[PDB]
Symmetry: D2
Subunit: 124 residues, 4 copies
Amino acid sequence: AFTVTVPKDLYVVEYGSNMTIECKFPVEKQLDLAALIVYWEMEDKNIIQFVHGEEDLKVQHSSYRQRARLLKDQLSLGNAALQITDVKLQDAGVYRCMISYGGADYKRITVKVNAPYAAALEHH
Amino acid sequence: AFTVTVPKDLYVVEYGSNMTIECKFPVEKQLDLAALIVYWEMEDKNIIQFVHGEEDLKVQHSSYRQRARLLKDQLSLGNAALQITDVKLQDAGVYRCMISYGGADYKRITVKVNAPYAAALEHHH
Amino acid sequence: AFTVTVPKDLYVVEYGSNMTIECKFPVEKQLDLAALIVYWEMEDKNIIQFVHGEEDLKVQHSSYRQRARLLKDQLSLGNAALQITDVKLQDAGVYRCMISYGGADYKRITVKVNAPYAAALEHHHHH
Amino acid sequence: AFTVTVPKDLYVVEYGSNMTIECKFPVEKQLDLAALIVYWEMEDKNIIQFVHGEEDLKVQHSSYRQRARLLKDQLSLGNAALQITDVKLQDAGVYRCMISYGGADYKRITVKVNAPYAAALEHH
Ligand SMILES: COc1cc(OCc2cccc(-c3ccccc3)c2C)cc(OC)c1CNCCNC(C)=O
Ligand SMILES: COc1cc(OCc2cccc(-c3ccccc3)c2C)cc(OC)c1CNCCNC(C)=O
């Protein structure tokens, strides 16, 4: 049936850098945006809400405003790519991509953030 | 849009008894089973996967073998009801019902388990 | 060797009741209160700091001020007993009794709180 | 009014490096050895049990075989430092320096371990 795959299970990112975490899902022919729903979260906090082809920033959690985006152009190749800028220590943890596309599945990804001491002190 | 609702997001449960935790979803006219997908999990342990009209016990966690049931009758009422038999202390925690039915959503339900000393001491290892 | 000991390391208590958690330490002759130090703590919130007979009220968490006390009567019997009145769901978790009395040791104790749905609903939404 | 004190609350150390976590206490006049118990632990695990001038390594936890040692000549200066060799990701977490010396206190130290991708991938 329908399966979301994560080739990369684990991301190790430096404080302040960028990360793009990815989930694959089968697109047989052209992509039908009307039947596609892509939800991204970490630890119950909403990051991405993609329905009928568009982002909805209504329940996007405070700490991800203007740092996170779904790369709409990857969707046609069957890649839900969540791009996050200016990574913080609070971004470490488990993420989840939930995809509904004539079928539905989700996977998790684990993010680890390395940081020097000054950033680590402020987050303590 | 498509909203999953939970009438109770907190259940309090006596050890060893049975519980049914519920998630409601919109059913327009008559349920189309072909278009319905339901996952029930707790803390990343899969309990139920329901696809194409049947229960998938594929990545089910072993502590839910023969204890966890989805009431199929209630799906046609728009009610994804998870029944868990003989509740144990390890059943305490956060549950997720994930529902795809032309649209998609999920809700969390917290289950608290009360137990007397004898059960609690055995769970203590 | 100085061995702090615990008769129950597991307590199961109902919401709203009172609990007394016991820690025992050897007292061979008469109690020398000047050499006794008792700390009671719950997941790094300090509940009692008892030094040389004086209960330190500098660092008692707001959560336990008004509800926790050390039973001074049992000290010369070799018992450092923490009493918590009107148990709340917040009280559940691992406690430590740390004792310095010519030597030093500590023990952990796990506390589980049962509560009716009504108390559980209050804590779930408003704690 | 004996008080244990730590120069720094937080350590950020690299995987595979060596770490000394420092901890201090009242010793104005010197230097009765026999009134001294030093106990180092990490999240319930015993690392260091110092009494009467020697470590007793019967309670020492298995993950600290050959890697944890107290450096005993600086206690005279009021310094009880725990040395950890070949820092592993397992070593991240909250440490406790417990000292009884005519009085008793203890202080917490948090350790965070940065590691490259290839090190993080095992575990995961
Ligand atoms: C937690 O708030 C969510 C979560 C969403 O996950 C959707 C999702 C996507 C892909 C797949 C799945 C899914 C996976 C496995 C089984 C069943 C379903 C889901 C579960 C989608 C969401 O809005 C589209 C919202 C937010 N709104 C909640 C109610 N209002 C609306 C407009 O809806
Ligand atoms: C948990 O095994 C410990 C823990 C120890 O903490 C020592 C310590 C050091 C300095 C201070 C303190 C302390 C701090 C604040 C207030 C009161 C006391 C402690 C508490 C010291 C220990 O041996 C010196 C041992 C081993 N005890 C052997 C008995 N074994 C059993 C099973 O029964």
